[PDB]
Amino acid sequence: YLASDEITTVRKNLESRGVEVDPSLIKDTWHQVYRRHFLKTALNHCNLCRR
Amino acid sequence: KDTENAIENMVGPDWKKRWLYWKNRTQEQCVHNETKNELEKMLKCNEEHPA
């Protein structure tokens, strides 16, 4: 989970480089970005559990 | 020049100063310099930013 103000830091780094961004595009991008990281990390943990 | 000296007072030594005289940022000076670098990026992107 990103703190209500952790959404504001994601907005600042994007705002500085020239990317229009709003808290809803940070929450949808994050929900998909962490669904993928979590599952792929779980599968790498599968690769390590195998041994 | 007064503004520059005040900046050096809050942000602390340069890295070249670290190799030159072994003279580095204090923790508060580290925070000040990181803020300064992010605020200089902000002015590079927008040279007309209000004061």
UniProtKB/Swiss-Prot annotation, chain A:
Compartments, as annotated in UniProt: Mitochondrion intermembrane space
Entry function: Constitutes the soluble short form (S-OPA1) generated by cleavage by OMA1, which plays a central role in mitochondrial inner membrane fusion and cristae morphology. The transmembrane long form (L-OPA1) and the S-OPA1 form higher-order helical assemblies that coordinate the fusion of mitochondrial inner membranes. Inner membrane-anchored L-OPA1 molecules initiate membrane remodeling by recruiting soluble S-OPA1 to rapidly polymerize into a flexible cylindrical scaffold encaging the mitochondrial inner membrane.
Name of the protein in question: Dynamin-like GTPase OPA1, short form
Organism: Homo sapiens
Swiss-Prot record, chain B:
Result of altering Q29R: In OPA1; loss of lipid binding and partial loss of function in promoting mitochondrial fusion
Gene responsible for this protein: OPA1
Function: Constitutes the soluble short form (S-OPA1) generated by cleavage by OMA1, which plays a central role in mitochondrial inner membrane fusion and cristae morphology. The transmembrane long form (L-OPA1) and the S-OPA1 form higher-order helical assemblies that coordinate the fusion of mitochondrial inner membranes. Inner membrane-anchored L-OPA1 molecules initiate membrane remodeling by recruiting soluble S-OPA1 to rapidly polymerize into a flexible cylindrical scaffold encaging the mitochondrial inner membrane.
Effect listed in the UniProt record for changing R18E: Abolished ability to bind and bend membranes
Protein known as: Dynamin-like GTPase OPA1, short form
Record's subcellular location: Mitochondrion intermembrane space
Consequence when changing W19A: Does not affect ability to bind and bend membranes
Effect of mutating K23E: Decreased ability to mediate mitochondrial fusion
Location of this fragment in the whole protein: 757 to 807 of 960
Top-level taxon in the UniProt lineage: Eukaryota
Source lineage: Eukaryota, Metazoa, Chordata, Craniata, Vertebrata
Intramembrane segments: 15-25
